[PDB]
Amino acid sequence: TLDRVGVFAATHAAVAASDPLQARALVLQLPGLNRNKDVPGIVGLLREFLPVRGLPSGWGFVEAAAAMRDIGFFLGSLKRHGHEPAEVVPGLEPVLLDLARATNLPPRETLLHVTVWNPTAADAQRSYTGLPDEAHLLESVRISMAALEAAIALTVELFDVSLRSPEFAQRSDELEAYLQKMVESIVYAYRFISPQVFYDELRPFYEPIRVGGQSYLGPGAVEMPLFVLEHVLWGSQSDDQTYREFKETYLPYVLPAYRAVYARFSGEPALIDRALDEARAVGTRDEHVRAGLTALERVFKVLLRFRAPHLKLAERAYEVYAPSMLGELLTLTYAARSRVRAALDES
């Protein structure tokens, strides 16, 4: 049914299958050293595979991204025990910067590296902690990342589809179906991830580190390119300070293609702004207009079925505090949906 997922999943699998540093058996030893808080051992283990002669000239994106993944687990690890990886590992910084250049991504590990680009097998999956809860968190992202990428494609396609077009409602219904995966992810997370374990054992691995004279954030699901999708859909012309700063903060961590999508739509009304103008130009009693707007409201419904439960998920973990950004974004989503619902009012 969600047949657009396959191609995105296949691109992720290419990186997951790559191990140019032949680091698999070495990275698997990291959880034990983390448990032992063995900083010298962690550095020693990294130096067993860290390139010292520059990157192999034959590497492409796949190899460079795979190398960053495997070095990357040592970065959040070292910071977890209170150390800047660049300061305690001679020659590491130049490698990170070279890998950043090769991939057009930050000079550390991102959500992509630790989830969809990380192999799934027990004898291959890289992990900070080796904990089941960490594996469950990775799975929760794997459930929806490829679907979300399809959804970004669909949103961009829907942007050029007139509300007057016969496809509008059908495309919106298809977008809704892919976005349902985000809901599935939060249901999964609620079921399988212990809030105590997340907060006490996993969260400390996700601190920022300093590379190239600036701070780079840790992997988190916050880096999923959902914010790019919603920039196009409803948010591009939002003057809300917290929201704009949120998007600009996470922009460097998403794939270059989605950074390009973001830029393309920043100088234009968002999809719903255009659709609502169209509804007003035709008249909101027109059944085809109403069909389109109703379909659009369902997209907002599914976005809220992710976002509201996610806030609860986040609150439960931090009860063991969540940033204001979450509730603020939730409210903005409600406001956007309300604009659609207002057009559908029959009085």
Question: Where does this chain bind ligand HEM (CB under 6 A)?
Answer: 140-141, 144, 185-186, 189, 193, 198, 220-222, 224, 226, 307, 310, 313-314, 317, 322-323, 325-326, 329
The helix/strand/coil state of 211 is: strand
The alpha carbon torsion through 133, 81, 28, 75 (nearest 10 deg) reads 100
CA-wise closest residue to 146 among 234, 230, 224, 67: 224
- 221: annotated binding-site residue? yes
Residue 105 — φ and ψ, nearest 5°? -135, 170
**Distance between CA 241 and CA 130 in Å, rounded?**
39
Q: How far is the CB of 121 from ligand HEM (least distance, A)?
A: 21
- 208 near 215, Cβ under 8 Å? yes
| 186 versus 299: smaller Cβ distance to ligand HEM | 186
Question: What tokens were used for 32?
Answer: 């034990």
Q: How far is the CB of 164 from ligand HEM (least distance, A)?
A: 31
| 26 versus 311: smaller Cβ distance to ligand HEM | 311
- 199: annotated binding-site residue? no
Q: How far is the CB of 198 from ligand HEM (least distance, A)?
A: 4
**What amino acid occupies position 101?**
R
CA-wise closest residue to 339 among 180, 233, 231: 233
| 167 versus 248: smaller Cβ distance to ligand HEM | 248
| 171 versus 310: smaller Cβ distance to ligand HEM | 310
**Distance between CA 186 and CA 305 in Å, rounded?**
9
CA-wise closest residue to 297 among 346, 328, 336: 336
Residue 216's H or E segment, with its range, is strand 214-216
Q: How far is the CB of 218 from ligand HEM (least distance, A)?
A: 8
| 20 versus 218: smaller Cβ distance to ligand HEM | 218
| 18 versus 144: smaller Cβ distance to ligand HEM | 144
Question: What tokens were used for 161?
Answer: 């589809």
- 72: annotated binding-site residue? no
- 310: annotated binding-site residue? yes
CA-wise closest residue to 103 among 245, 259, 244, 248: 259
The alpha carbon torsion through 229, 233, 235, 237 (nearest 10 deg) reads 130
**Distance between CA 324 and CA 326 in Å, rounded?**
5
| 170 versus 242: smaller Cβ distance to ligand HEM | 242
- 51 near 67, Cβ under 8 Å? yes
- 270: annotated binding-site residue? no
User: C-alpha 15: how far from its chain's center?
Assistant: 16
CA-wise closest residue to 69 among 9, 27, 121: 27
| 46 versus 146: smaller Cβ distance to ligand HEM | 146
- 119: annotated binding-site residue? no
Binding residues for heme: 310
List binding-site positions for substrate: 219-222, 318
